[PDB]
Symmetry: D2
Subunit: 401 residues, 4 copies
């Protein structure tokens, strides 16, 4: 309330600090949206974002590390520059995504994800910078995570230990409605290659193998759990009709709400692929993807605290697929709310690219960044909340084996 240094007053400061930075935050979104770049090729977005945190006044007050582990990834850190000597500081992480989609551009609104992560972290710092009483030990960490749509850049960062010292991690994703949580499933990719032998009696038909595998999985759909998903293509199904195909290649991905269910679904698919080899006489290589994507672990305490802030900002509550943030949420407590940006268009369509770059989307983006920053302030000043986040994180970890 009207009290010296209230949490409600710090929350107001962070919202004022975000409104003051609206112009240059909009420029940041425009720079990434206008130059769409694909996974691991986000060189321009990496330059724009590293320069953004280097130029925040005072110069070099954000400690920026470009090319952090990945060439297009980065890391920016800020803390109050004073020590006292008590005693573990709180580490709060904010993620920026910035990879686009082939052909249609930023049809997932990833330019706004970079903006919202930068804005939230800016707002937190400004609320803590305007504090007389020595501020609690906090480090604001920003991580640029490339290649969300393909590869999974967060996973490469996890393998470098980038998340081992974070206590909470925040990010947000533009969608069609406002929701503090939405079920993103685990995912496993696979590439299947069949090899036979090229009169047609003396023939092993690798095209038959591909078709029989397709038939095997198709009838299996009747026994799939209703939450499971299986999609795939025949990449190579022959070259010339006068030669019996001695090579075929399929590309599939499977999805399930948990890792244990995903392993069961993957094993039944493996049987379907191996059966086609047995029936055709071909040999088969089944090569899984480099990284499995994890389902997103929810955190009741963090989500309930986030919704209470958004309701004050005026957000009314009620996705794209699977994200490498699920791997993050398995090692650091986090939230990944989806927000609406003034459009009815669907994600990963051409009309969403229009909305993602529109002037009208800027209001909704900064508003949700305000909600993230206030939620970070809650964790900083409510120790009962921090233990609540850690309790919910520990319990959900056991239920996922």
């Amino acid at each position: 309330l009207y009290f010296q240094g209230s949490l409600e007053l710090l929350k107001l400061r962070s919202a004022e600090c975000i409104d003051e930075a609206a112009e240059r935050l909009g420029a940041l979104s425009r720079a990434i949206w206008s130059q769409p770049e694909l996974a691991y090729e986000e060189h321009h977005a990496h330059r724009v974002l590293t320069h953004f945190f280097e130029r925040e006044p005072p110069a070099a007050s954000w400690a920026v590390q470009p090319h952090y582990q990945l060439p297009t990834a980065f890391r920016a850190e800020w803390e109050p520059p004073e020590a006292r000597a008590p005693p573990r500081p709180l580490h709060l992480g904010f993620l920026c995504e910035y990879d686009a989609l082939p052909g249609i551009g930023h049809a997932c609104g990833h330019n706004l994800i970079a903006e919202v992560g930068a804005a939230a972290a800016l707002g937190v710092r400004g609320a803590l910078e305007g504090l007389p009483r020595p501020p609690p030990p906090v480090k604001v960490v920003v991580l640029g995570t490339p290649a969300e749509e393909d590869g999974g850049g967060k996973i490469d960062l996890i393998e470098a230990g980038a998340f081992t010292n974070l206590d909470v991690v925040f990010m947000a994703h533009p969608s069609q409605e406002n929701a503090a949580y939405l079920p993103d499933m685990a995912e496993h990719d696979v590439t299947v290659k069949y090899y036979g032998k090229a009169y047609p009696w003396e023939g092993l038909n690798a095209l038959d193998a591909a078709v029989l595998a397709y038939n095997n999985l198709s009838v299996f759909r009747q026994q799939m759990k209703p939450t499971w998903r299986v999609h795939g293509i025949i990449k190579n199904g022959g070259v010339k009709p006068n030669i019996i195909p001695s090579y075929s290649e399929l590309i599939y991905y499977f999805r399930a709400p948990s890792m244990k269910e995903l392993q069961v679904l993957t094993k039944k698919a493996e049987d379907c692929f191996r059966a086609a080899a047995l029936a055709s006489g071909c040999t088969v290589e089944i090569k899984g993807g480099a990284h499995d994507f994890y389902n997103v672990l929810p955190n009741k305490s963090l989500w309930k605290a986030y919704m209470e802030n958004g309701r004050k900002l005026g957000i009314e509550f009620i996705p794209s697929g699977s994200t490498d943030f699920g791997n993050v949420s398995f090692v650091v407590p986090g939230i990944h709310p989806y927000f609406h940006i003034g459009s009815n268009a669907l994600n990963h369509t051409e009309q969403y690219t229009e909305a993602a770059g529109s002037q009208e989307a800027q209001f909704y983006t900064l508003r949700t960044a305000k909600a993230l920053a206030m939620t970070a302030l809650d964790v900083i000043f409510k120790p009962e909340l921090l233990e609540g986040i850690r309790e919910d994180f520990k319990l959900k970890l056991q239920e996922e084996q």
Copy 2:
């Protein structure tokens, strides 16, 4: 020629003896045709045929053994009753078939097969009975072989040793044209049963197994040798749609021109059946038929001698499927000529039953019986022919491993 006791004169005697017996031979065909009986159920035909050889004058001059090994099989033997004491007699076999088809009756003309086997043997005896100079040691053996269309009664007789002491075996089969030999293939029967487990996620779908097996074999047809044949049905594909089928059953038969090719074809089918089990998660029982049918081994010497007789009778030369005579032809040299009976109807159709019982078919049946009997006389009096039959039989046996 016009020489005392010429082979040409004995051949004429056998034709006269067959013409004299035309009336009662026609009655024999009529008795079997008018009362069609199925495999192993030919009780009436067994009575008619045993009574036929018992009534041939003088009474009991044919040594008849009813219920020989099988209830509806029989054996009849005749030899010149005088001994001399020299020295191995020649054993000449003639087979009678007499089983019909379900519903359509004697649509394969099996009544005429019984007639032609009885007639040939009658003609041989009459040619040798009217001989003054002590006749060469010969035993005429007639074997009633039931269950040709299903089961294979000749094979049951082979297992009892019925063919171990025969030197040559004769029979003939009514068809659409006249041919001393026609390619009957080997055959292997199989019954495939799938077992699963009965919400549908917790389900093993045995109907999927049947359909996937069908798909597996269907695409395999492109790589089958053009002489191979595969036919099958889904006998049991479920009972009620609201229960996931936990049981399915297929019935298939495979055909190939040789036993070595048939084993290769059977092994690829086995892979197709097992792949469906792997893809569906079901277990599978693959039960082969009680008896595999063999392809018919030709005998150049016997066939060339048969065609030379038929040409004298006026027969001009150029099938149903697979016959257990192929198993016989692997242990005794034999011939299985097909003959035309005055009709364009196809075997195993309703209109062939009409032809098989017609008066017009009697002329062609007795004519081909005349050709068989003269061919038997050739073997009896041409030792160079007998060794030629045995040489060709020995060589063909090696080529079939």
Copy 3:
């Protein structure tokens, strides 16, 4: 409260009247459970239930009509016998089901459905019988509806106009948990018959038609809405392998949450069935079931009033498939709550038959009957509720076209 003739006091009377009748209501359930009868064959259950309402004291105070429209259906009615002359009486319906399942008996607990419908109606009458002040014009109607698991006896009753004068209809169904509503989908049954022509070149393969139809639907599953369901069997897939099958027969049922979605799903299946005919060369008969089952329309006012009563009885809130009550709920406002009976066994399994007939299930059955009866009392004495039920019923009817 402690007021002369309170609704809370009438609700207590109905619970006392149900407890007093527990012994003979248990006997009623035992009589149906011990003699399981199938659809349209429930002659013994029809006798037991008609005799039950005829014996309720005073004799013939329930007006019983046996063999109502169907041979095993019945109708029982009671009202206060006094007229006043004001003015439309309220008609309250209670349904009794009593058909079992082949082999496993009453694995859906339908004996308890008959009991709960009889008990609810008994409790309502006893609450209104013990009233001095002239009671509001009410008619309690009980309808025996045979053949729920097959055929749909309620639909036959709808076609006779049995529901045209009911204002509200009640029934309850034993399951695994307590829920005032659970989503039962619409359903459409179909029987598909393929006709071809019986050498195999001159052949139309009706078995191919069945298998191709199966393949057509199987790959379609990937594009089915996740709430849709398709299940089917190959009833007839051939008779003998040596005859090319000229006839095949499939039996399928489809489910969708609305009639509009069900028509779309049925049309795509029709394309899959017709494509198999085109590909094989066969003709096809597609024969839909005699009666389509409708999805169950919820009624917010009735369900919220029912849950408020159950909470007082001690019921804690949170199915089998599709029911012909959905057709009823489209013409009369109704509720179809599911209740737990002391077991973890699943419906339509052998172990549920054990629970359905157990002594332990009697407490839960009478308890839910108490909840239904009190809910009926709410409708009788709260005119604001009756209009609320009619408003919600009218609006839901428009959303379903």
Copy 4:
């Protein structure tokens, strides 16, 4: 015999003229074999062959027309230069093929086909050049026909009228054995394209269409005539698994021994392709090849005359697929004998390329060219043969509708 100007003496002259030209004919084969060129790209072979006939002494005695209708086709003509004025001259055609195979080179021995056509025509001219008595009116015509393995260059030449004035046409093809005729079937090519629409419920799956078409044809194989052939590939079966494929493409070719059978086979395939569209909901384009290849019409008189010559040369008598010579044989009487070249390797394999260019193949090639040339001499001097060829050609034309 030893008679002035005997046909046997002219036949000897043609064999001597071919032996004298062995060195430069071998060089011709070597020039084409060492520089393999594909269909319609045979620029170097066109230069070599046109220069060959231009250099035959006396210069320009062969009237050479380069770039005849096609850029790599050619035409060379020779006749005795003297007129007499009687009266229609005999036109005798010899074809040269010279296109190779992708990757493996001249694995069909087409370099030897060019050689044998040049050699036969050289031998005919030399036999007629060494004649005093005015020679009968004959024109020797050589036609370079490119693109046999793809496209069908003879068909392009037929459409230009190149064959309308030929009386007999000769060519020969290296294989594994010596045969005056071998059954080459008719062929029809087709390209099938499926178009759908890209959540997956709102999806038309063009990949399903391709797979269902494959299933439709696969089960049809059981009812195909045993002489029919169907082969095909899935050229395009998707691009990325996360997008439902809205486009697929198949490439198939069908073969049958006659055009009437080929139309029936093509119509059943058309049904299979259209059924997949109906089942999937996609639209379909079925585009047949630019040119259908015809089966080769035999000519008993020409073949019997050819075998009588080859037997004198020492050839003992007893393929690759389908050839555009079948279209030629439908408008001009011709023969297309296959000859052995000293190898057991199969056509269109890497080891056949070795044999085709070997020194050992030259003897067999020149020998068969001798047989062709003597057969041409038979037609020139036996008018009874010419009418016999024309009678057999006319009758076979009616049997093919």
